[PDB]
């Protein structure tokens, strides 16, 4: 229905305004684009799906996402990769370790203040019905 379609409408706003003020956070730079084969060629033989908060607004508009749950599936994803590929003691590791914690933590917060859990259970119904 058009109703239907408002809804997802409504949830695609939301998460493009989230995904900004992820990317805009100057902890995050490192997350803001995807690794450059040339600088790190090792990447992609160790990570097998790449995730970058540039790659996540493309997606939004892509109508990839039907609800917040298949959102926050990406930003686990992001965090996931950077604690899997930078996993040693060393000071450049632990820093980008903390940075990928603090932007799955961040994102979640945002989410349980600004989301209301019966819009999103509305998008979980019509997602179910299709
Ligand atoms: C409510 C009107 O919305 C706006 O003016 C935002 F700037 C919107 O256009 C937007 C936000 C983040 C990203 Br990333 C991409 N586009």
Same mark, same amino acid.
Do not use: W
């Given at each position: 229905?058009?109703? +239907?379609? @408002?809804? !997802?409408?409504? $949830?695609?706003? !939301?998460?493009?305004?989230?995904?900004?003020?992820?990317?805009? #956070?100057? %902890? !995050?730079?490192?997350?803001?684009?995807?690794?450059?084969?040339?600088?790190?060629?090792?990447?992609?033989?160790?990570? /097998?799906?790449?995730? #970058?908060?540039?790659?996540?607004?493309?997606?939004? *508009?892509?109508?990839?996402?039907?609800?917040?749950?298949?959102?926050?599936?990406?930003? #686990?994803?992001?965090?996931?990769?950077? $604690?899997?590929?930078?996993? @040693?003691? #060393?000071?450049? @590791? %632990?820093?980008? %370790?903390?940075? &990928?914690? &603090?932007?799955?933590?961040?994102?979640?917060?945002?989410? /349980? +203040?600004?989301? *209301?859990? *019966?819009?999103?259970?509305?998008?979980?119904?019509?997602? +179910?019905? %299709?």
């Amino acid at each position: 229905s058009m109703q +239907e379609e @408002d809804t !997802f409408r409504e $949830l695609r706003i !939301f998460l493009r305004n989230v995904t900004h003020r992820l990317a805009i #956070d100057k %902890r !995050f730079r490192v997350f803001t684009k995807p690794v450059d084969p040339d600088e790190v060629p090792d990447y992609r033989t160790v990570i /097998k799906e790449p995730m #970058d908060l540039s790659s996540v607004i493309s997606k939004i *508009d892509l109508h990839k996402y039907l609800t917040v749950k298949d959102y926050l599936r990406d930003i #686990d994803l992001i965090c996931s990769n950077a $604690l899997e590929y930078n996993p @040693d003691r #060393d000071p450049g @590791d %632990r820093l980008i %370790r903390h940075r &990928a914690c &603090a932007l799955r933590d961040t994102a979640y917060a945002i989410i /349980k +203040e600004e989301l *209301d859990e *019966d819009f999103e259970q509305l998008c979980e119904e019509i997602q +179910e019905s %299709r």
